[PDB]
């Protein structure tokens with residue numbers, strides 16, 4: 001059995017309902033892995049640090065797909081440490097930072113006004129989900145918003161899931177590190193301004209300029225692809241459930257709970273969350289050997305009908321929506337869940353408040369699904385909307 005199963009994000013792959021909780025798969029890099037897909041066993045793996053994320057990038061171990069970050073930088077990740085580093089990052093991704101909610105509300109409103117000026121149809125990825133995600137990451141890093149197009153150009157290659165090394169990935173990595181290194185010298189605000197303040201002070205002698213830049217580049221990359229991927233596929237969910245989208249547009253007070261259910265039902269994760277077994281361990285009816293690759297499948301857990309009865313139904317009032325695994329779990333639980341949810345709430349409210357009776361402008365089977373990539377994503381998402389308010 002080959003993994004992944006399909007790049008089509010219109011509905012849960014048929015294969016998910018056919019998997020045993022743990023099954024042997026062949027990865028894109030050609031290695032063997034244990035695919036874990038029940039809620040109980042996804043929870044088990046994610047909450048047990050003997051399943052190691054850090055060790056999945058060790059030289060020689062079985063791989064899901066090729067590294068896209070240069071191996072010498074990957075190998076130096078464990079040395080990027082400091083009370084002030086963790087502090088700087090936690091502060092930058094806090095959605096309560098003064099001005100940030102106001103900035104996101106204005107920028108979302110402006111992007112939606114440009115779609116309305118253009119008229120239907122528009123590609124809501126290129127006119128909204130992408131620029132709204134890219135600009136917010138420029139805002140929290142403290143760099144100019146004109147960086148968004150330069151840095152974003154790397155991302156369709158940087159998050160590829162390739163069987164082989166990707167030459168473009170190194171060229172783009174070096175170009176992005178150079179840009180972020182330059183910003184350490186001229187940036188006074190946000191994550192980069194904070195990192196510049198630590199550089200050449202006590203406790204930070206062990207952090208190179210390259211290592212400071214690495215924090216900027218990887219946080220920009222991770223944040224932008226997670227938020228732009230989620231928001232595109234949250235719109236795909238809403239555009240395949242038009243009567244629910246119409247209901248949410250009329251009941252904006254629902255938006256906090258709606259985002260939890262959109263996260264639970266979301267199909268943007270195109271791979272598995274990798275972990276390396278650091279000991280012999282039992283996982284349900286399977287015996288995992290030390291050094292074996294485990295692939296956690298969030299969509300398996302999230303559509304497990306023993307936890308989420310009627311899992312294919314989009315139900316904004318679903319009581320346990322917030323128990324999903326779309327932000328992972330355990331030690332590596334997304335640190336930016338507060339910001340990802342607030343960003344989605346603001347973006348989706350701006351779209352639904354201004355574009356009445358929002359509809360797919362093409363038959364759902366005429367969407368073009370990105371292949372060979374960490375996220376399921378439609379290449380374009382053409383939409384139309386009715387008149388008036």
Ligand code: HEM
Pocket residue numbers: 053093219222223224226227230273274325326327328329331332333334335336337339340341
């Ligand atoms: C809806 C938006 C987002 C989604 C769905 C999402 C999802 C995830 C998931 C599933 C993980 C776990 C990966 C694993 O266990 O292997 C993760 C980790 C992480 N996310 Fe998020 N994320 C979102 C937004 C963001 C944002 C905005 C940032 C940063 C600005 C970010 C930064 C990170 C980082 C740095 C990690 C790694 C944490 C670690 O290794 O301990 N995420 N995210």
